[PDB]
Amino acid sequence: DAEIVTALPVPLAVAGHHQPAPFYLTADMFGGLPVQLAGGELSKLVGKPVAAPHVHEVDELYFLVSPEPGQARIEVHLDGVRHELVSPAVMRIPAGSEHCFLTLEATVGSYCFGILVGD
Amino acid sequence: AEIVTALPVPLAVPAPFYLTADMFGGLPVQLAGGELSKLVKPVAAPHVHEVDELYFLVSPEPGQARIEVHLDGVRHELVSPAVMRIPAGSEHCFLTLEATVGSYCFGILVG
Numbered sequence: 001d002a003e004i005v006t007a008l009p010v011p012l013a014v015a016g017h018h019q020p021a022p023f024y025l026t027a028d029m030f031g032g033l034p035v036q037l038a039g040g041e042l043s044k045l046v047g048k049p050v051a052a053p054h055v056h057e058v059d060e061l062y063f064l065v066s067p068e069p070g071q072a073r074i075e076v077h078l079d080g081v082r083h084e085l086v087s088p089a090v091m092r093i094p095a096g097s098e099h100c101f102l103t104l105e106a107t108v109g110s111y112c113f114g115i116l117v118g119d
Numbered sequence: 120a121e122i123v124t125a126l127p128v129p130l131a132v133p134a135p136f137y138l139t140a141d142m143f144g145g146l147p148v149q150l151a152g153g154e155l156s157k158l159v160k161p162v163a164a165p166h167v168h169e170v171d172e173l174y175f176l177v178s179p180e181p182g183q184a185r186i187e188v189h190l191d192g193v194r195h196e197l198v199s200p201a202v203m204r205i206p207a208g209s210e211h212c213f214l215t216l217e218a219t220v221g222s223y224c225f226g227i228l229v230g
């Protein structure tokens with residue numbers, strides 16, 4: 001009686017996001033999780049932001065990964081300051097900070113995941 | 120700005136970690152894994168953790184990655200995208216059957 005979730009992703013609305021964001025871990029799974037995890041492969045998102053600047057009441061981590069280092073690059077806007085992230089990278093967005101990301105470069109198999117940390 | 124770029128962190132279980140419990144003043148999860156196209160590896164070692172572990176299997180397009188999860192004497196064949204909970208104490212491991220470049224399995228230890 002293993003617990004398996006395959007009805008994925010779970011689309012959930014997130015502030016300032018044009019479309020519901022694709023979640024792979026949500027806070028209610030498996031009796032309750034201390035994180036939520038959303039994101040996707042970036043190869044078709046180059047130049048196309050998924051959201052306008054937005055604020056969360058929880059910390060969010062951007063996790064940028066690609067098969068080979070350097071194959072993915074995003075620009076993170078953090079309270080009006082721009083930061084370039086190169087795969088592999090993890091960036092913490094403190095709760096209350098206005099932020100969003102723009103994909104600069106991405107191969108097939110490049111991902112950015114946003115990990116909401118449950119406080 | 121808090122950015123970590125010295126990644127992955129090899130830790131003994133050695134697994135490549137992208138989130139460790141000490142990052143950013145303390146995290147409630149740890150996250151390890153890697154892309155699967157080079158793991159498609161004839162064997163894999165059963166092991167147990169003291170915390171729950173979630174397998175998160177993804178590929179650029181749905182269905183492009185496939186693993187076998189062995190959990191306490193039962194074999195499970197999972198197709199991307201999939202998430203599977205491995206309860207703390209349960210003997211387990213996974214084997215990659217099929218994976219396009221850019222497929223990942225992450226093991227997420229839930230504190």
Ligand SMILES: O=C(O)C(=O)Cc1c[nH]c2ccccc12
Pocket residue numbers: 020021022038039040041042044045050112113114
């Ligand atoms: O895989 C795609 O095409 C996406 O929609 C990616 C995506 C949507 N919302 C996000 C929030 C954080 C990281 C990636 C995404």
Ligand SMILES: O=C(O)C(=O)Cc1c[nH]c2ccccc12
Pocket residue numbers: 133134135151152153154224225226
């Ligand atoms: O050894 C490597 O290069 C790996 O990719 C290890 C790995 C891939 N997926 C995982 C999930 C949980 C623990 C280790 C791995």
Ligand SMILES: [Fe+3]
Pocket residue numbers: 054056060099100114
């Ligand atoms: Fe955000």
Ligand SMILES: [Fe+3]
Pocket residue numbers: 166168172211212226
């Ligand atoms: Fe494990």
